Amino acid sequence: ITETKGTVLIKTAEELMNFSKGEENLMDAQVKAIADTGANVVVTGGKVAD
Amino acid sequence: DGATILKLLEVEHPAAKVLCELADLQDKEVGDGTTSVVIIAAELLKNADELVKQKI
Amino acid sequence: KVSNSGITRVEKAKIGLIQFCLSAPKTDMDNQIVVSDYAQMDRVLREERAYILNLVKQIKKTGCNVLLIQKSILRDALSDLALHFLNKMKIMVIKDIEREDIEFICKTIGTKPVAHIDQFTADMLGSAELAEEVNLNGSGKLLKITGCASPGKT
Amino acid sequence: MREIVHIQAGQCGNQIGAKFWEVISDEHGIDPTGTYHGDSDLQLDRISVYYNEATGGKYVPRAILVDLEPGTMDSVRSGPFGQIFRPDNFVFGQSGAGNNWAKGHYTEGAELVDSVLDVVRKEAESCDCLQGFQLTHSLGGGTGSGMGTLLISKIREEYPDRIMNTFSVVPSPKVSDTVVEPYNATLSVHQLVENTDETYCIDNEALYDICFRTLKLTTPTYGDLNHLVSATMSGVTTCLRFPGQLNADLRKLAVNMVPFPRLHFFMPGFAPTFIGNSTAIQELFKRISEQFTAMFRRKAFLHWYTGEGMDEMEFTEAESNMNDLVSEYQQYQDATAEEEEDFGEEAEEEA
Amino acid sequence: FANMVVDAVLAIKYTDIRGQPRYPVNSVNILKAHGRSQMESMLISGYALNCVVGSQGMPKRIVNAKIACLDFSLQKTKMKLGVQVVITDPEKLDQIRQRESDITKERIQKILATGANVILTTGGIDDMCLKYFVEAGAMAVRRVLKRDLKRIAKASGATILSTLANLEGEETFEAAMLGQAEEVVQERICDDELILIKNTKARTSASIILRGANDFMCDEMERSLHDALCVVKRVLESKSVVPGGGAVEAALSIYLENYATSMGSREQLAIAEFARSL
Amino acid sequence: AVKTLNPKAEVARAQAALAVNISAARGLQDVLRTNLGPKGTMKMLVSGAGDIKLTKDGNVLLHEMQIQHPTASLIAKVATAQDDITGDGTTSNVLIIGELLKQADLYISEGLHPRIITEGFEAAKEKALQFLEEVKVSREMDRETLIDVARTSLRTKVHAELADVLTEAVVDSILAIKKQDEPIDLFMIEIMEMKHKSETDTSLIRGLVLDHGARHPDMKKRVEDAYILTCNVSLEYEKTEVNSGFFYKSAEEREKLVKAERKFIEDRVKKIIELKRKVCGDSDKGFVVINQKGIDPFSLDALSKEGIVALRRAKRRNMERLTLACGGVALNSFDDLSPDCLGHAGLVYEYTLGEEKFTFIEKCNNPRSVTLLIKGPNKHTLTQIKDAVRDGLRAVKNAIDDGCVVPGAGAVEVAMAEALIKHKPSVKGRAQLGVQAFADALLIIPKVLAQNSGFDLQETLVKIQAEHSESGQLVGVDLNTGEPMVAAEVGVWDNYCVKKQLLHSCTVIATNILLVDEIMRAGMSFLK
Amino acid sequence: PVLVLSQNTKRESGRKVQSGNINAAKTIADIIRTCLGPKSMMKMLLDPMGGIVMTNDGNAILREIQVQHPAAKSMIEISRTQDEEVGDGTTSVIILAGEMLSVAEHFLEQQMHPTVVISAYRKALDDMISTLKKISIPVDISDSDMMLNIINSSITTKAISRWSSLACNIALDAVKMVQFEENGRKEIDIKKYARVEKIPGGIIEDSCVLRGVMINKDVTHPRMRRYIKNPRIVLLDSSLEYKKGESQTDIEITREEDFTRILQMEEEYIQQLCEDIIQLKPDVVITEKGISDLAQHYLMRANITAIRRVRKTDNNRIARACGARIVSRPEELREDDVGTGAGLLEIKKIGDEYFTFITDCKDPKACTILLRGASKEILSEVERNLQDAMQVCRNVLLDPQLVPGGGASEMAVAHALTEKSKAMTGVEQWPYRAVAQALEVIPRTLIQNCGASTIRLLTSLRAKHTQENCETWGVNGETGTLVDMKELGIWEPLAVKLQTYKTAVETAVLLLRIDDIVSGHKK
Ligand SMILES: Nc1ncnc2c1ncn2[C@@H]1O[C@H](COP(=O)(O)OP(=O)(O)O)[C@@H](O)[C@H]1O
Ligand SMILES: Nc1ncnc2c1ncn2[C@@H]1O[C@H](COP(=O)(O)OP(=O)(O)O)[C@@H](O)[C@H]1O
Ligand SMILES: Nc1ncnc2c1ncn2[C@@H]1O[C@H](COP(=O)(O)OP(=O)(O)O)[C@@H](O)[C@H]1O
Ligand SMILES: [Mg+2]
Ligand SMILES: [Mg+2]
Ligand SMILES: [Mg+2]
């Protein structure tokens, strides 16, 4: 996320419906891109999200 | 100055606070003679009590 | 005491009682003004001045000499700009009238309370022969209104 | 991650910091030897903001301890939780200021501020990206106020756009421990105004009147007052130290809390924490100025400052800007304007 | 001191409806400054301010003084509580920040375009605004007490302004609301400084400066002088005087002791005691 | 008198104040007299915390003894003022003050007013200054004379073996940072200390040593031929001065803004990388960045991916020193970056000592700034060596700044005493007595020296005065035979400004002390 | 219970109050009377902060003492009023007040009312003033030798007399450099433009007065020049950096390019600011606020030297010296506000510390005084002595009159009053003479400090003043003989004597009117 304070500002209903699906799709794309290189184990020094 | 002296002192007997406020009133209304009025009032009170000790 | 600086005698006084505020606009609902360009900063001040001046001119149009303003503890009932304008029109201003003696005042001098500028008409005013502040020698000041054309039973 | 270093100056500052760090360490599982024996790793998500990790597993606080007299460091080292600090972070002189603002700001401070600035450089070199400073001091002393203010100015020069917060104690209304307290307080507020983002004014008598009546049992010394102040500071900084439903550093509180830059003084509270921009500050300053003038009109104790290098007009400028601050605070209420001076003369004629 | 007091009281007589004249004492300022002997106390035909000039770059003597009295602070403008600034286009930021520093300037010029030399203010004056007075060659005094401003404005013929707005939408400053004084000086007295305004033209005014050995002495003299001022005021207002030293008490005692005989009751004793107590 | 007004006051009247002052001055000199000379003894000082300090310096000893006296405070302040200007001569000052007061008391106790002795002091001071103005020796100030002066000033703090090591370093550094004008500027000699490798390894480096290293694991530890870039521009995440916040719509906008918020620093890093590629085309030379502000892990990663060594938060004064040593330009912005701004260094490397890191910059062309590297096994050892180094540097600088140097070992004091004894017949009145007193005080410097070497004061002093009376050679004490020796030929040299300042200060303070009538403590006990 | 009327107030009345007041005044006078004349001895005092004051000045002694009796407080206050009004004579006023109060209890104990004594003292003060004005001597202020003589005669009593010919010169120069006439006809010798800087070390003979000013500052960046020959100086009251406003400003951004854009505009701001300075082509920039690093970069590119965080007082003195004026907005900077009256700017090291000198001014109206010496206490005493000397010089410049010293004026006035008193009748004749004979305590004290026979010297001097023209005879305070002040050359300004007599007599009048004391009345 951004270092400066950031807020998700919505003005219509469709954005409100689509936000969570957008986040989930982005996270899936990132994980699959990492996995496609052949890595079997990931080691991190911070929090892991659900 | 009678008013200043009586204002700077601390008093608690009501019969003396009456005279202190008398001096303050004399200062406010006129601005002079704030020492003579206390003397006059005290002497009047004393001479009246001398009569009231007799059955007057 | 009178908030006006200079006027202490009114002969043939016309008196009105006010229950609204001569200040900047403020809706009972949460309001705020957003500025995003440099012209709006001057425009806000100009419109504020015009808004106050309009109310003062409306008050003057009816012939009022003495104004009574009831106490308000949520918004300012009389700002410096309004007081300056009222002084420029030779109107004596008295503020901070308690909320519990309004009935006595209305019964005495025959005023009718006004809670809206649209209802400030020449028929809601009372008439008195003299309105003036007196100064006791050292104990302070006082304000007397005497010679009411329509006297109540007080 | 966005580290903060903490600076303590003076006897009162040292006493408060020694308990602030004690009450922080028990929250994160640190031991008086520096090791860690906590259970929940939620304590380690934001541990690096206040502790620097050394080789071998120890954690050392990001703290610098400063005073002009070696009396208080000996107590701090000999006291509880006084052996986790870095031994090279103790800076002290040999004489002391003796409750003189001028000596702290001009004579004795100038030959020691360089050591503090050389220690903060090494403490800042070890953090990836610092975000600000914490300062604890007093307004009624010589080392706490004058030297602390000089240090604030120097830090502001060296570090341009980093945040700065202070936790300053203030003189009490009906009791003044020092004869020259108004002078020190007035001369320190002048440069607290323009060199800090927020100030957390703490009063001694107000918090002192809680142990007798609310705590139901005390005849105490500075002791538990200090512990209560430390608890207040921990309740303030829990947002920085811990993650929650909505975490926010002190800047993210200030931006919502400070609309106008120069009105940045607060009054705390505690209900087991409350922080408020109550304008009851305007009552405190109105008192201090009231004392200042009363002494300055008589030129009392002035030669003790003039001999150190200060000029007579510095007091005049300080009091002028104190009056400016008081008027700026007063212009926000429009209700205290009703209490104008009662008119005494009788000239109320034509106009 | 009797001559000083009589002159000071006569200098304050005001012109009422003319039914009766009035003498508003305590409109004459009294200032204390220890130093020379008490015979060096001075009466000033004008007014004296316990204030100093705003900046050390200003002039400290004006020969023909045009005075403008103000009742508001000359500082860079800030929007009120209701108004706030929200920026979505960065290009519009800079022009905003200039305006805050320009509005107040546009006011000062309006005051200085009419030839005003001395400006008195009950509020503060920013250091950014002192430079305009410094360049124009003018004196500015800040943090003036309200009552002093009222007395100065009444004496010199000026008009007190809490704002520049007129009966239209705009702000103007006219030359008809300026007072005129024949001299304005900054004087030095025993290591401090104060301001003299001499020979005001609308009305006569007075002030007194009291010199003494130390502060206790000067305070006692001020308290003493107040009594004489009040006595002279009472004598002028009511045209009657009475002897002193005890003539009144003796005469009243004799008269009341004689008059008590006619009552012939128990009030006779009380009247006699009143006479003896006098 | 003051007791009737303040019952709690403390007073000391005419004959008691003088006794108090004399007693305290003698008490101070009785302790400080064991330091004088190369044969003085060493003191150990332990504070409340338990830290240990071994010392022989007069100023340190004065400021670390547990004393509460007013006139002791006066004398300590005088010693501090002498030290801060000259840096040498803080024991002789106290000794001469004490002896002057004792000699004055010797005559005052016989019914003589102190003003006569004061006038005698003034006349004797003028005569002594005139004599010192003609004893001095002017020379070229070559390397050998400076070696002699530095060694003389250093053998009184450390033993001979370490003094022979410190002398060369001090003289070489002072000669290295000197121009033929523009008087010598210290602060161009950095004193760094490392705790290992027993102190005979103290050295001089014609470069710089910095107490911090590279913060990325993938940076090169040794560079053989390097360009030096010195800057104080910030490569940290920076925010707008005015309040600001991000308002996005979904995840993709959030990502766009996240990558957008870094360009202001990526531009600076790209400027540095472009300059490095332009200058160091082939991977044969090096590039080193010394910064006074912070550097992010992102910027560290970007720089290290190219082969750049970067240091963050160097000290402010180094901003000058590097520019005088490496020979570049210290810059605040990157909008004009060019190859003239770069300096050159012939070796850059790193050394790890326990928990700490050091960086060495060496092999510069003509460095105008050098470093004195202190070494030793303890901490008090390093502190003592640091004090000795300060004394030596000040001595050499004062020798160069003046065009003259004065013979030592006490010869000049004997000469002044003999010259003053024959001047007192000319003056009139009882003031002669005062002159006599002054002369005797000037003999406190030779006596103590002899008494520190195990000889007898009076017979050795008589032997010294036997010469300089038949052969006018400037003769002083030989601290291993007790026989007179010609100080100049042996190689014992003293500074001229030190002696002049010492005479002035001692006379002024003794004169002001002798005229104190009564001591008063009648004010507020505490400022509370 | 405890029936009371005044809550533990303590009241005293009667003759005991008068005796106590007089005794307290005499006790105050007794502490000081050993410090009058050229043979005075010093006193060392300890303040509540641990310092030391080794001094000889009467006010410096009295203001360091805590006391309870109100009469002592009145005496201390009159001492400080004398110090503030004229700057000299704070010892003789205390002794004179003590003597005049001492010679009154003799009449108070002989059933004489205080008002008679008050009237007699007030009558005698006027004759004292007239006789003082009668024997005055005018002085020509364009003769430098006479002014040096007056200053020397003023400082032969203090500790810097050993360097008198030095100090005198210093003082004179300083005053002559601050006398200043401006709009109108108001002339001033204000002493807030003559700053005294003390640097321990060196020798006292190196003290001097600079034609310029001296500050404890250094260049902001090392590459700035430390030696400029004929600089042009601009003085700023503002900060050369980007700051926040006060109108509750916030920014909301949604586009990628805005953030960086904003961060650029700040820098652009700085640039134009610097340009508005470079358009005037100066060499030195002095500001009371901070300076940003980007501004330093631009100024160095323009070959400028910058200093930061100078005090307002120092900026005012620099403006008065070099001839510039202070500016707070660079956009309104003109050519008339650039100071071109300086002649050198140098930056030196004085004992491991950097100092900035602005010297060789064409015609400065402000100066600085640089003192060197053994330690802090000696320099503090030298500072006090220099203050005394400069105040005396200002007094003589504002009122060119002189009266003899050494006790000639006291004996002349006493003889005049004694001769005048034999033309009066009534009781007031006896107090009227008393004050006259109270003026002889000044010569007597001098004799006692010299170590001579007061009983014979005083009567010889009294016999000498009886003759027709011997108004200038006095006591030589160093040997103990009678000598004419014409040849010895001890003259003092008339203002000091007038103030001394007035303050002493008025203090006696004030203290003679008390009759009772009330204490502990809770404000
Ligand atoms: N010259 C005088 N001769 C006789 N009596 C006087 C004289 N002056 C004042 N008095 C008397 O003094 C009294 C006033 O005393 P004062 O101390 O002024 O106190 P106050 O007037 O406040 O009572 C008056 O009654 C007056 O008769
Ligand atoms: N080799 C030597 N032989 C004789 N005297 C010496 C020798 N070395 C130093 N001195 C004397 O020692 C004195 C200085 O002693 P020191 O302990 O350095 O104290 P300080 O220099 O602080 O007075 C000088 O007067 C010098 O003459
Ligand atoms: N050489 C002198 N011979 C005789 N009297 C002197 C001499 N010098 C000064 N005085 C006298 O000493 C007095 C000054 O006293 P001093 O001790 O300087 O303190 P102060 O000036 O505060 O009284 C003057 O009245 C002067 O007449
Ligand atoms: Mg009366
Ligand atoms: Mg030595
Ligand atoms: Mg004198």
PDB file of all heavy atoms in Angstrom, chain B residues 1-3 26 31-39, chain E residues 227 243-247 249, ligand 1:
ATOM      1  N   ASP B   1      -4.773  56.875  53.996  1.00  0.00           N
ATOM      2  CA  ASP B   1      -6.155  56.994  53.457  1.00  0.00           C
ATOM      3  C   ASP B   1      -7.036  55.968  54.169  1.00  0.00           C
ATOM      4  O   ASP B   1      -6.707  54.769  54.102  1.00  0.00           O
ATOM      5  CB  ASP B   1      -6.205  56.821  51.937  1.00  0.00           C
ATOM      6  CG  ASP B   1      -7.619  56.883  51.385  1.00  0.00           C
ATOM      7  OD1 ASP B   1      -8.320  57.872  51.679  1.00  0.00           O
ATOM      8  OD2 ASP B   1      -8.012  55.940  50.674  1.00  0.00           O
ATOM      9  N   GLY B   2      -8.127  56.418  54.791  1.00  0.00           N
ATOM     10  CA  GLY B   2      -8.974  55.533  55.571  1.00  0.00           C
ATOM     11  C   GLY B   2      -9.532  54.384  54.754  1.00  0.00           C
ATOM     12  O   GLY B   2      -9.532  53.233  55.200  1.00  0.00           O
ATOM     13  N   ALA B   3     -10.007  54.679  53.543  1.00  0.00           N
ATOM     14  CA  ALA B   3     -10.592  53.643  52.700  1.00  0.00           C
ATOM     15  C   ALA B   3      -9.565  52.578  52.341  1.00  0.00           C
ATOM     16  O   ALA B   3      -9.852  51.379  52.404  1.00  0.00           O
ATOM     17  CB  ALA B   3     -11.182  54.270  51.440  1.00  0.00           C
ATOM     18  N   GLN B  26     -18.422  56.013  51.199  1.00  0.00           N
ATOM     19  CA  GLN B  26     -18.031  57.417  51.266  1.00  0.00           C
ATOM     20  C   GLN B  26     -16.987  57.745  50.209  1.00  0.00           C
ATOM     21  O   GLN B  26     -17.013  58.829  49.617  1.00  0.00           O
ATOM     22  CB  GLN B  26     -17.506  57.751  52.661  1.00  0.00           C
ATOM     23  CG  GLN B  26     -16.901  59.137  52.795  1.00  0.00           C
ATOM     24  CD  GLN B  26     -17.912  60.246  52.634  1.00  0.00           C
ATOM     25  OE1 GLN B  26     -18.025  60.844  51.569  1.00  0.00           O
ATOM     26  NE2 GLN B  26     -18.645  60.536  53.698  1.00  0.00           N
ATOM     27  N   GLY B  31     -15.568  61.032  47.626  1.00  0.00           N
ATOM     28  CA  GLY B  31     -14.143  60.955  47.382  1.00  0.00           C
ATOM     29  C   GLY B  31     -13.268  61.609  48.429  1.00  0.00           C
ATOM     30  O   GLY B  31     -12.044  61.632  48.258  1.00  0.00           O
ATOM     31  N   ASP B  32     -13.851  62.137  49.501  1.00  0.00           N
ATOM     32  CA  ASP B  32     -13.092  62.771  50.567  1.00  0.00           C
ATOM     33  C   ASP B  32     -13.843  62.577  51.876  1.00  0.00           C
ATOM     34  O   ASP B  32     -15.048  62.321  51.893  1.00  0.00           O
ATOM     35  CB  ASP B  32     -12.865  64.258  50.286  1.00  0.00           C
ATOM     36  CG  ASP B  32     -11.764  64.851  51.139  1.00  0.00           C
ATOM     37  OD1 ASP B  32     -11.025  64.076  51.777  1.00  0.00           O
ATOM     38  OD2 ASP B  32     -11.645  66.093  51.182  1.00  0.00           O
ATOM     39  N   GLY B  33     -13.117  62.706  52.979  1.00  0.00           N
ATOM     40  CA  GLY B  33     -13.716  62.525  54.288  1.00  0.00           C
ATOM     41  C   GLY B  33     -14.043  61.090  54.634  1.00  0.00           C
ATOM     42  O   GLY B  33     -15.049  60.835  55.305  1.00  0.00           O
ATOM     43  N   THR B  34     -13.215  60.142  54.196  1.00  0.00           N
ATOM     44  CA  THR B  34     -13.471  58.738  54.491  1.00  0.00           C
ATOM     45  C   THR B  34     -12.956  58.334  55.866  1.00  0.00           C
ATOM     46  O   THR B  34     -13.237  57.223  56.324  1.00  0.00           O
ATOM     47  CB  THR B  34     -12.838  57.852  53.418  1.00  0.00           C
ATOM     48  OG1 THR B  34     -11.436  57.727  53.670  1.00  0.00           O
ATOM     49  CG2 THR B  34     -13.032  58.462  52.050  1.00  0.00           C
ATOM     50  N   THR B  35     -12.198  59.206  56.533  1.00  0.00           N
ATOM     51  CA  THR B  35     -11.722  58.908  57.879  1.00  0.00           C
ATOM     52  C   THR B  35     -12.636  59.495  58.947  1.00  0.00           C
ATOM     53  O   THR B  35     -12.843  58.871  59.992  1.00  0.00           O
ATOM     54  CB  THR B  35     -10.295  59.432  58.062  1.00  0.00           C
ATOM     55  OG1 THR B  35      -9.407  58.720  57.193  1.00  0.00           O
ATOM     56  CG2 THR B  35      -9.828  59.254  59.492  1.00  0.00           C
ATOM     57  N   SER B  36     -13.204  60.672  58.698  1.00  0.00           N
ATOM     58  CA  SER B  36     -14.066  61.310  59.682  1.00  0.00           C
ATOM     59  C   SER B  36     -15.390  60.579  59.861  1.00  0.00           C
ATOM     60  O   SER B  36     -15.953  60.587  60.963  1.00  0.00           O
ATOM     61  CB  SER B  36     -14.321  62.760  59.279  1.00  0.00           C
ATOM     62  OG  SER B  36     -15.159  63.404  60.217  1.00  0.00           O
ATOM     63  N   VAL B  37     -15.906  59.952  58.802  1.00  0.00           N
ATOM     64  CA  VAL B  37     -17.210  59.300  58.891  1.00  0.00           C
ATOM     65  C   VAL B  37     -17.147  58.095  59.823  1.00  0.00           C
ATOM     66  O   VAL B  37     -18.088  57.830  60.583  1.00  0.00           O
ATOM     67  CB  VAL B  37     -17.720  58.930  57.483  1.00  0.00           C
ATOM     68  CG1 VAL B  37     -16.941  57.771  56.890  1.00  0.00           C
ATOM     69  CG2 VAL B  37     -19.200  58.617  57.520  1.00  0.00           C
ATOM     70  N   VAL B  38     -16.031  57.363  59.803  1.00  0.00           N
ATOM     71  CA  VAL B  38     -15.873  56.220  60.699  1.00  0.00           C
ATOM     72  C   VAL B  38     -15.839  56.686  62.148  1.00  0.00           C
ATOM     73  O   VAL B  38     -16.472  56.086  63.027  1.00  0.00           O
ATOM     74  CB  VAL B  38     -14.608  55.426  60.326  1.00  0.00           C
ATOM     75  CG1 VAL B  38     -14.455  54.224  61.227  1.00  0.00           C
ATOM     76  CG2 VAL B  38     -14.662  55.000  58.876  1.00  0.00           C
ATOM     77  N   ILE B  39     -15.111  57.772  62.415  1.00  0.00           N
ATOM     78  CA  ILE B  39     -15.029  58.310  63.770  1.00  0.00           C
ATOM     79  C   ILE B  39     -16.411  58.733  64.250  1.00  0.00           C
ATOM     80  O   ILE B  39     -16.819  58.431  65.381  1.00  0.00           O
ATOM     81  CB  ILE B  39     -14.036  59.487  63.818  1.00  0.00           C
ATOM     82  CG1 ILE B  39     -12.625  59.049  63.417  1.00  0.00           C
ATOM     83  CG2 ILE B  39     -14.005  60.096  65.200  1.00  0.00           C
ATOM     84  CD1 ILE B  39     -12.262  57.647  63.822  1.00  0.00           C
TER      85      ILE B  39
ATOM     86  N   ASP E 227      -7.685  62.584  45.535  1.00  0.00           N
ATOM     87  CA  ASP E 227      -8.568  63.275  46.469  1.00  0.00           C
ATOM     88  C   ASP E 227      -8.754  64.735  46.081  1.00  0.00           C
ATOM     89  O   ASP E 227      -9.879  65.249  46.093  1.00  0.00           O
ATOM     90  CB  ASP E 227      -8.007  63.179  47.888  1.00  0.00           C
ATOM     91  CG  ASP E 227      -8.147  61.793  48.484  1.00  0.00           C
ATOM     92  OD1 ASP E 227      -8.487  60.849  47.742  1.00  0.00           O
ATOM     93  OD2 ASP E 227      -7.911  61.646  49.701  1.00  0.00           O
ATOM     94  N   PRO E 243     -16.461  76.255  56.076  1.00  0.00           N
ATOM     95  CA  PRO E 243     -15.177  76.330  56.783  1.00  0.00           C
ATOM     96  C   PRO E 243     -14.771  74.984  57.361  1.00  0.00           C
ATOM     97  O   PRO E 243     -15.573  74.063  57.518  1.00  0.00           O
ATOM     98  CB  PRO E 243     -15.425  77.351  57.895  1.00  0.00           C
ATOM     99  CG  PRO E 243     -16.653  78.062  57.519  1.00  0.00           C
ATOM    100  CD  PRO E 243     -17.460  77.176  56.641  1.00  0.00           C
ATOM    101  N   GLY E 244     -13.482  74.882  57.686  1.00  0.00           N
ATOM    102  CA  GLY E 244     -12.904  73.671  58.218  1.00  0.00           C
ATOM    103  C   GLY E 244     -12.151  73.922  59.513  1.00  0.00           C
ATOM    104  O   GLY E 244     -11.963  75.060  59.947  1.00  0.00           O
ATOM    105  N   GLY E 245     -11.723  72.823  60.123  1.00  0.00           N
ATOM    106  CA  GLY E 245     -11.036  72.880  61.394  1.00  0.00           C
ATOM    107  C   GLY E 245     -11.889  72.567  62.600  1.00  0.00           C
ATOM    108  O   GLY E 245     -11.347  72.436  63.703  1.00  0.00           O
ATOM    109  N   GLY E 246     -13.200  72.439  62.432  1.00  0.00           N
ATOM    110  CA  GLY E 246     -14.086  72.144  63.533  1.00  0.00           C
ATOM    111  C   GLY E 246     -15.111  73.207  63.852  1.00  0.00           C
ATOM    112  O   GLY E 246     -15.778  73.102  64.887  1.00  0.00           O
ATOM    113  N   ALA E 247     -15.253  74.231  63.009  1.00  0.00           N
ATOM    114  CA  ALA E 247     -16.278  75.243  63.241  1.00  0.00           C
ATOM    115  C   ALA E 247     -17.674  74.647  63.117  1.00  0.00           C
ATOM    116  O   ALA E 247     -18.569  74.958  63.915  1.00  0.00           O
ATOM    117  CB  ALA E 247     -16.098  76.399  62.262  1.00  0.00           C
ATOM    118  N   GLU E 249     -18.694  71.500  63.560  1.00  0.00           N
ATOM    119  CA  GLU E 249     -19.032  70.614  64.667  1.00  0.00           C
ATOM    120  C   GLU E 249     -19.407  71.402  65.915  1.00  0.00           C
ATOM    121  O   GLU E 249     -20.394  71.080  66.584  1.00  0.00           O
ATOM    122  CB  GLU E 249     -17.870  69.668  64.952  1.00  0.00           C
ATOM    123  CG  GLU E 249     -17.745  68.533  63.951  1.00  0.00           C
ATOM    124  CD  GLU E 249     -16.871  68.887  62.767  1.00  0.00           C
ATOM    125  OE1 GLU E 249     -16.501  70.071  62.633  1.00  0.00           O
ATOM    126  OE2 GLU E 249     -16.550  67.981  61.970  1.00  0.00           O
TER     127      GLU E 249
HETATM  128  N1  LIG H   1      -5.117  73.873  57.677  1.00  0.00           N
HETATM  129  C1  LIG H   1      -6.008  73.253  58.484  1.00  0.00           C
HETATM  130  N2  LIG H   1      -6.327  73.758  59.694  1.00  0.00           N
HETATM  131  C2  LIG H   1      -7.211  73.146  60.499  1.00  0.00           C
HETATM  132  N3  LIG H   1      -7.841  72.003  60.182  1.00  0.00           N
HETATM  133  C3  LIG H   1      -7.615  71.388  58.999  1.00  0.00           C
HETATM  134  C4  LIG H   1      -6.663  71.996  58.065  1.00  0.00           C
HETATM  135  N4  LIG H   1      -6.623  71.200  56.985  1.00  0.00           N
HETATM  136  C5  LIG H   1      -7.475  70.170  57.207  1.00  0.00           C
HETATM  137  N5  LIG H   1      -8.067  70.282  58.407  1.00  0.00           N
HETATM  138  C6  LIG H   1      -9.054  69.336  58.980  1.00  0.00           C
HETATM  139  O1  LIG H   1      -8.692  67.985  58.691  1.00  0.00           O
HETATM  140  C7  LIG H   1      -9.869  67.193  58.541  1.00  0.00           C
HETATM  141  C8  LIG H   1      -9.700  66.189  57.410  1.00  0.00           C
HETATM  142  O2  LIG H   1      -8.683  65.242  57.715  1.00  0.00           O
HETATM  143  P1  LIG H   1      -8.104  64.264  56.579  1.00  0.00           P
HETATM  144  O3  LIG H   1      -6.808  63.706  57.105  1.00  0.00           O
HETATM  145  O4  LIG H   1      -8.128  64.998  55.263  1.00  0.00           O
HETATM  146  O5  LIG H   1      -9.107  63.007  56.507  1.00  0.00           O
HETATM  147  P2  LIG H   1     -10.588  63.013  55.878  1.00  0.00           P
HETATM  148  O6  LIG H   1     -10.763  64.343  55.197  1.00  0.00           O
HETATM  149  O7  LIG H   1     -10.520  61.860  54.911  1.00  0.00           O
HETATM  150  O8  LIG H   1     -11.498  62.780  57.054  1.00  0.00           O
HETATM  151  C9  LIG H   1     -11.005  68.153  58.240  1.00  0.00           C
HETATM  152  O9  LIG H   1     -12.043  67.989  59.207  1.00  0.00           O
HETATM  153  C10 LIG H   1     -10.426  69.543  58.369  1.00  0.00           C
HETATM  154  O10 LIG H   1     -11.254  70.323  59.231  1.00  0.00           O
END
